[PDB]
Write a protein that binds this ligand. Structure first.
Ligand SMILES: Nc1cncn1[C@@H]1O[C@H](COP(=O)(O)O)[C@@H](O)[C@H]1O
Ligand SMILES: Nc1cncn1[C@@H]1O[C@H](COP(=O)(O)O)[C@@H](O)[C@H]1O
Ligand SMILES: Nc1cncn1[C@@H]1O[C@H](COP(=O)(O)O)[C@@H](O)[C@H]1O
Ligand SMILES: Nc1cncn1[C@@H]1O[C@H](COP(=O)(O)O)[C@@H](O)[C@H]1O
Lengths: 160, 160, 160, 160, 160, 160, 160, 160
């Protein structure tokens, strides 16, 4: 089935983080593609990917990178689609550089930014799901189930 | 004319920032409502607003607050809709508390976060528009026009 | 015996930190309950817990969470009881996000915030004790003993 | 009329902030004293103030200071009473030095810390009131009224 | 008279800072061009500017931007020329977002980064001059004179 | 021989850091005492230590602590002697809390602050030595030798 | 009348801060010299100033600079005398760059660092005085008087 | 062959980082020297190195250090050559101190600063290469090849 979400990441080293977005989309049965695209090492690959995303049928892009993390913002520069940004935890600055590089977009070109690291990757996929759910009733019910199970599954007290 | 986006903010002092989201939605002809909801002063008002948003026909919530900024995250706790968070600039810490208290959502409850301040409010509205544009071709055409005009309006050289 | 302190925490993963509050309360023989309550994954569980805390005989609530740590503040939103907040050390940002999310409450809804991590969990319990001690003479004497033993036990010089 | 809360601050320059704690205690009819005590300029005055607070009938101390803000922690060192700390905003570092030097107390000597600046001072007074309200029903009723009014006074929409 | 340095900046608001680079290059008689290029509003203009810089005879690019500052890094992605980045001071975060989003380039695509603000713009021009001075003896002599004058012009004592 | 430097530290856990000050003083044959003194757990022990330091023949105090690190400043509050402060690396905030708690002393009561961690402990001892050297010619020559050996011993190129 | 303290600063813009060190030394009758020395604009002037300070009869150097503040550390590199560093507040980063670039000296070359800004300058002078007071009884008596007056001059309550 | 790039570093402990610059220069066949030079422990060694660099035929200096990292800036103080600075990751502050110490140079004496850590060391060498490439066609072609291989080698999708 044709992908409706693109997951892109700046490097293989981001995969340990971005796999959490991939897994969540698969759990909810959201067809998606998962690609490496570097804003800096493959800038024309990025331009082409972002420019053609909509005509290819993508609805949402999830972009993850670390450091001077420009992949989400430059993707949003070329697509009208919603772009969600995952700050990957960097070694020295723990993703604060990633976070500021992604979230602080000037007015005109948005990136919806999620938490640093694996939680943000998971939430980027959930956010993409909640967007798709607006016009896909079956997916909306599966998302409702997912959220209900999350809530119901929280224990009442810690295990010691 | 029925609202499809809800803009909520923690206080009147947030309006100087959040008015930019309001203006952009009006510019793009996106029907919306604009409210004050305090996560800490009116927690039950928030619970009811967020719980009922989808059945009231809202598709996206834009939530803005500053300091220990819980409004977006708690909104997202109670709705299955996409929630976008605007960190309002705070006096002492310049919105860094706003930013971290909004963006660092743990796995399972996303908030799509935008830049600190007016830029973020503007971009929350643009991000909401790009979401709605996925299943509204007239709006998609208006957003394309808007993006194209932004691109065409950048000058080639500075004024000295 | 009926609990007079509630310890609540956002997740099982917080228990490694919050167990230090539990242990201290037990050492001082302060009856207490220890629960998982997520502001974001179980928001109605939190509303109910906080709303009914006083009528259930609780005097003080100790709430711990990490990241966008909204559990203490949203608990204080619904209870008139004093709420003490423990910032749990987060992976990337080392609890700075937890700290700012908890301590930077706007005027009107306070959270008494303790240090990031285990020391804060221990001190949240000691602070709760010092509050209860105001109207429980036996506990006040046990707290006096605890503080005296802490002081007396500090060695005069390091072991090499 | 005998004070049950002590407000102490490191300098006259702290009063612009700490006056908000004073006002709120008066509003709630909580008898209190308001003093300047410098941890570094009058360390013996501090030792004596804190040592004797409980026997003088104080139940809670609210301590405010900025920069390397030692006043709350050293107060807590010498009293068994609950000490609440207000980080006063500093010129260069905007109260981040105030905050960290107050909140990061090691295990065994708590300071319940509130927000940087006026909000924190207000909330220290509210937190002190919620503590006293535990064993003062008239005050508990006044605080409930106060909280309920805060909730009722939040508007539903912003003014443009 | 053909330009050997390109100064590019993300917006007119950057000119207050980047004008210092322009002035210093003129002072040292380094022919240059000064343009506005938005990484996010005119991404294809940027791609073309950077791709073609070397064949147009440019030797160094000085790029200035603020906030999530992608202009220097994306310029460097598309040119083999040395790119120098000037972090423009931002309103809320004082150029710390500018700084981290410029300097933290991952391995393989350098941006030589200068100080936040006017100093950085001035120093980008001086750094560009020292680069050009390597294979331009007349310019090398002008730069030596400039450095020597800077050294000679420092007073020996302050004015009171 | 009577100690002329006092090393004091807030806890046994600081010794891993403060031993570097001890070792340096011993290397230079500077008689000294090494003690645990907690500002918060043993405040009267600190008052007495600092108050009597000068009459006991101490010339310089080196004080190390972590977190809300008030030991150096409160020591300086009671002694006219120069106090040097060593920020101990804390677990969560890596000694930034220690650093700000120590260095940001208001005017009137100084603490000469050294680097976070072991380097600062070593340098506190070297700084104390350079102070004593002003009026002890033999020690001054041993310090000169120490500095000369440091300089001479730096290799010219790295070992691979 | 021969100077025993040298105050050096990187620029005239530093004088607004460093004048407080000058004033305090004059108040305590400590003969001193006050100079501008730029670590980066006059590196050989600095080398010569620092190399020769001890033979010229200086006992302590107070060095102030802002931004990438190398003046104190490089001074300490070339003198065996105690060097005290004053972080001058910087425009964008509020002296945090000044602070870290002064205090974080690696092992072997100390700089005793004081607070950001005017407080630090004042305290550098007081710290220098406490050093000199060790072997100057008349000065020791003046400093005691000064400290005692500071203590006596703290008011007991704020002015409203 | 005579070196045209000097790599200098403050300590053997920096070599784990700076070896990445060495390796890159060797890969591109750029003759270079690799030296330890401490700004603080060997200040005259630094003065001499920087002063004579140009007359020795060096074109670019790459300087790496950590903490109060003054090596790059003080090198630039004495040479007219372009100096590139590599912030070495420090233990406590993760190279934020290194970064600010290097990048925040006031106007007049530039250091082109690269990312914290190994990526910055690699990029300092690439930046030096892109400078040399301006007047060495063979090297320019080898750099073009290097950049082309980097781009071409990025995989299209992650390995799981
Ligand atoms: N910002 C960016 C642009 N292209 C890649 N990156 C990022 O560079 C970091 C390191 O990549 P690598 O490990 O391949 O050097 C990764 O987090 C990746 O997102
Ligand atoms: N803020 C919040 C709300 N609900 C849970 N959390 C926090 O999310 C973090 C991670 O939870 P988990 O490990 O279950 O993902 C924990 O520190 C927990 O307090
Ligand atoms: N600030 C302070 C006052 N008394 C002790 N500390 C500090 O508390 C930290 C932790 O002490 P402990 O490990 O005993 O809890 C140590 O760095 C010690 O200097
Ligand atoms: N800033 C500086 C001046 N001279 C050496 N350093 C730095 O000091 C740190 C620690 O050096 P060492 O390990 O030898 O103590 C290294 O990062 C080195 O660049």
């Amino acid at each position: 089935s044709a992908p409706v979400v693109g997951i892109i990441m700046g490097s293989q080293s981001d995969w340990e983080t971005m796999r959490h977005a991939d897994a969540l989309l698969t759990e909810l049965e959201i067809p998606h593609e998962t690609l490496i695209v570097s804003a800096h090492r493959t800038p024309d690959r990025l331009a082409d990917y972002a420019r053609t995303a909509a005509e290819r049928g993508l609805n949402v892009i999830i972009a993850g990178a670390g450091g001077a993390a420009h992949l989400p913002g430059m993707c949003a520069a070329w697509t009208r689609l919603p772009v969600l940004g995952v700050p990957v935890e960097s070694r020295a600055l723990k993703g604060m550089d990633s976070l500021l590089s992604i979230v602080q977009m000037p007015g005109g070109v948005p990136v919806g930014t999620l938490a640093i690291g694996a939680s943000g990757a998971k939430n980027a996929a959930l956010l993409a799901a909640s967007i798709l759910a607006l016009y896909n009733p079956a997916l909306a019910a599966r998302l409702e189930t997912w959220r209900a199970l999350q809530t119901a599954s929280v224990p009442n007290s810690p295990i010691t």
